[PDB]
A paper describes a structure:
Here, we report a thick filament structure from the indirect flight muscles of a third insect order, Hymenoptera, the Asian bumble bee Bombus ignitus. Flightin is essential for maintaining insect flight muscle structure and performance; when flightin is eliminated in Drosophila flight muscle myofibrils, defective myofilaments are formed and flight is severely impaired. The C-terminus is embedded within the backbone based on evidence that deletion of the C-terminus results in filaments of irregular length, whereas deletion of the N-terminus produces filaments of normal length but in flies that cannot fly.
The non-myosin protein flightin reveals a newly resolved extension at the C-terminus that overlaps a previously unassigned density in both Drosophila and Lethocerus. Here with Bombus, we observe for the first time what appears to be the complete density of the part of flightin embedded within the thick filament from the C-terminus deep within the backbone to residue 41, the first part of flightin stabilized by contact with the proximal S2. For flightin, AlphaFold2 predicted a reasonable atomic model for the WYR domain corresponding to residues 56 to 102. The model of the two ends of the flightin density was rebuilt de novo using Coot. The density corresponding to the residues on the N-terminal side of the WYR motif of Bombus flightin, similar to that of Lethocerus and Drosophila, passes between the myosin tails of one curved layer to reach the outside of the backbone. Flightin’s interaction with five different curved layers possibly explains its impact on determining filament length. Our more complete density of flightin resolves the identity of the so-called “blue” density first seen in Lethocerus thick filaments and later in Drosophila.
Numbering used by the authors: 41 to 151
The structure:
Amino acid sequence: IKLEKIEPPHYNHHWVRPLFLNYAYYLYEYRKNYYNDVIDYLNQREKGIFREPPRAQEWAERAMRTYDEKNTDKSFKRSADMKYIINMRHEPRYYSYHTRAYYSLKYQKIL
């Protein structure tokens, strides 16, 4: 059996330098999403309080929920975004003026 053809194998790095890198920064925050929300609802319901059964969730909505969980700064200035439409004024306006007293002990008699 002749006429063997080979391709360059491996190309393993000869000057060592393999290095390593941890990856828990993103995997944990994304893996945790599927299981926690369900289980965090399963056990919390087991605690004795009810809410909506687990709906199937789409990636963007799950990311939004994780973002809401992460932002510990539960900004009260969303209520500021609303008081852009609020801060109502002049509801207790008067436009009526005072009555004074045009009295000099007038007598209408009878009564």
